[PDB]
Amino acid sequence: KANSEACRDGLRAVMECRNVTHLLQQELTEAQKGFQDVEAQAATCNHTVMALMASLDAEKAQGQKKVEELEGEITTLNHKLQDASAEVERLRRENQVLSVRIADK
Amino acid sequence: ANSEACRDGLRAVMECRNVTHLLQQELTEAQKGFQDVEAQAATCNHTVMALMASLDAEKAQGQKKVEELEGEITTLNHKLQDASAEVERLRRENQVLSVRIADKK
Amino acid sequence: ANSEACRDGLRAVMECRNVTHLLQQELTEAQKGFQDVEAQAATCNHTVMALMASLDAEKAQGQKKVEELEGEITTLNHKLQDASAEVERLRRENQVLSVRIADK
Amino acid sequence: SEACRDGLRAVMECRNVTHLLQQELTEAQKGFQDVEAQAATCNHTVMALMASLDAEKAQGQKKVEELEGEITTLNHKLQDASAEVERLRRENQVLSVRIAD
């Protein structure tokens, strides 16, 4: 009489359990998505890190090769200037002689 | 140990999946459980109802035979009273004829 | 982005943890389910054994009582014959003596 | 009443099984935390390098143009001092010819 009734409740609790493992199953699939995206993300991050260092190195090399070029320029000009100041001195001193010789005759 | 954290996370997730299948199996079995208990109750209630039936019968069949046999005792008593009376009748009658033979000579 | 996959993954895990607690509760209700049913079966099982005893007890009286009276019947039957016998004896004597009187 | 017993047994078993689920879920929770920890080690690292690069540009484009504003600043000196050579040369040749006269 109230044996059908207890069985019933019994079956209800079992049925709640079934539905519930149902959500469980799916949320597990999301947990799986999570780790898989994390793997994808870390992979990209590997990619990025070998490329980062490489990029830095490249930049450095470039800057360097384009610096020892520039300071070869700087000294070259210092020389030329050193020389043109020399010509200037040669010419000042020489001109005086010529003008003194001119007063003399 | 790069991917080893993603991995271990992934295995756990799978293990959960295997464990919850096992759950589904064991709930199916709990469900069998309740279905069958209802089966058995039905059976038991039948047994109960049948046992009482066959008690009632016994009581009726029983008190029926008693009355049939108490009846028959009755008639047999009467018949013995009739026969016994008849025996005492013929004893008296006898003695009276015996005497008429003695008082004859 | 990094933080999001963790965030979302972890939430999932927690939701499952959550939902297992619910399972345990309902399992306990199932357990209650069966213990109730067991009680009821115990009862029904006692009720049963009782009738199987009465029935037998009832058979044992019926059996016996009937036997009683059926014996009472037989002894009356014999007594009935004995008296029907003794009668015979006497109708015999009667006719015989009554003739002797007729003669004389 | 075999059904109770068996039913009861299955129930107990779900209970056992569900606790195993709980342990494995705790172990998944662990995964996600270990991973988050590394995404941090990792983001940090990357971040540090971008920063290291950018600072290299700030050394680079400041050094270069500190030394190119040294080029042209010597160049102007060259142009001007060698304008003085052309002055003095023409003027030497003038004077030389006033001599020979």
Between vectors from CA D42 to CA D40 and to CA D43, what angle results, nearest 5°? 70
A57 CA: distance to closest CA in chain D (Å): 9
User: What residue ranges do the domains of chain A occupy?
Assistant: 1-105
What is the radius of gyration, based on Cα positions, of chain C? Answer: 45
Distance (Å, whole) CA C23 – CA A19 = 10
Residue C54's nearest CA partner among B54, B97, D48, D30 is B54
Could you give the residue ranges of the DSSP H alpha helices within chain C? 2-103
Q: CA dist D91 to A94, A102, C70, D45, Å?
A: 11, 14, 180, 69
At B5, which amino acid appears?
A
Q: How many CB atoms lie within 10 A of CB B2?
A: 12
Which residues, at least 6 apart from A34, have a Cβ–Cβ distance to it below 8 Å?
C5, C6, C8, C9, C10, C12, D32
For residue A68, which phi and psi values (nearest 5 degrees)? -65, -20
Distance (Å, whole) CA D26 – CA C10 = 10
Query: Number of Cβ pairs closer than 8 Å across A and D?
Result: 97
Q: How far is CA A11 from the centre of its chain?
A: 63
Give the DSSP letter of residue A68: T
Nearest residue, CB atoms, B38 vs list A4, A25, A35: A4
Q: Which two tokens stand for residue D48?
A: 């540090």
On chain A, the residues whose CB falls within 8 A of the CB of C13 are 27, 31
Provide DSSP, B34-53: HHHHHHHHHHHHHHHHHHHH
On chain C, the residues whose CB falls within 8 A of the CB of A37 are 5, 9
Nearest residue, CB atoms, C10 vs list D21, D29, D42: D29
Nearest residue, CB atoms, C13 vs list D7, D11, D25: D25
- What resolution in angstroms does the PDB record give? 2.6
Distance (Å, whole) CA C43 – CA C37 = 10
CB atoms A3 and B30 under 8 Å: no
Cβ atoms of residues C77 and D43 within 8 Å: no
Between vectors from CA C65 to CA C61 and to CA C67, what angle results, nearest 5°? 120
Query: A interface mutation test: which of C3, C14, C17, C19 has the most A CBs within 10 A?
Result: C19
Q: CA dist D47 to A40, A50, B23, B91, D37, Å?
A: 19, 13, 46, 146, 15
Could you give the residue ranges of the DSSP H alpha helices within chain B? 4-102
Which residues, at least 6 apart from A87, have a Cβ–Cβ distance to it below 8 Å?
D82, D85, D88
Q: Which CATH class is domain C1-104?
A: mainly alpha
CB atoms C52 and B52 under 8 Å: no
Provide DSSP, chain D: -HHHHHHHHHHHHHHHHHHHHHHHHHHHHHHHHHHHHHHHHHHHHHHHHHHHHHHHHHHHHHHHHHHHHHHHHHHHHHHHHHHHHHHHHHHHHHHHHHHH-
Residue of A nearest to C13 (CA): A31
Distance (Å, whole) CA A3 – CA D33 = 49
Distance (Å, whole) CA B99 – CA B62 = 56
D30 CA: distance to closest CA in chain C (Å): 9
Distance (Å, whole) CA B80 – CA A5 = 66
Distance (Å, whole) CA B77 – CA B83 = 10
Q: How many CB atoms lie within 10 A of CB B85?
A: 11
Between vectors from CA C69 to CA C63 and to CA C75, what angle results, nearest 5°? 135
Q: Does B10 touch chain C (CB under 8 A)?
A: no
Residue of C nearest to B105 (CA): C104
Give the DSSP letter of residue A62: H
On chain C, the residues whose CB falls within 8 A of the CB of D33 are 10
CB atoms B15 and D24 under 8 Å: yes
A63 CA: distance to closest CA in chain B (Å): 34
Residue B30's nearest CA partner among C31, C20, D19 is C31
Residue B45's nearest CA partner among C51, D4, A6, D5 is C51
Distance (Å, whole) CA B32 – CA D3 = 8
Nearest residue, CB atoms, A23 vs list C2, C19, C33: C19
On chain C, the residues whose CB falls within 8 A of the CB of A33 are 8-9
CB atoms A7 and B34 under 8 Å: yes
- Using a 10 angstrom Cβ sphere, with 0-12 exposed, 13-18 middle and 19 or more buried, the burial of residue C64 is exposed
Q: Which two tokens stand for residue B79?
A: 């018949």
Give the DSSP letter of residue B103: T
CATH topology of domain D1-101: 1.20.5
Query: B interface mutation test: which of A1, A9, A14, A41 has the most B CBs within 10 A?
Result: A14
Look at the alpha carbons of A86, A88, A91, A97 in this order and tell me if their dihedral is positive or negative: negative
C55 CA: distance to closest CA in chain A (Å): 25
Using N-to-C axis directions, what is the helix angle for D2-100 and B4-102, rounded to 10°?
A: 170
Nearest residue, CB atoms, A74 vs list D14, D70, D85: D70
- Using a 10 angstrom Cβ sphere, with 0-12 exposed, 13-18 middle and 19 or more buried, the burial of residue B10 is buried
CATH topology of domain B1-105: 1.20.5
Distance (Å, whole) CA B12 – CA B78 = 99
The experimental technique behind this entry is X-ray
Residue of C nearest to A25 (CA): C16
Tell me which residues of chain B, numbers 28 to 57, contact chain A at a CB-CB cutoff of 8 Å. 30-31, 33-34, 37-38, 41
Query: Number of Cβ pairs closer than 8 Å across A and C?
Result: 78
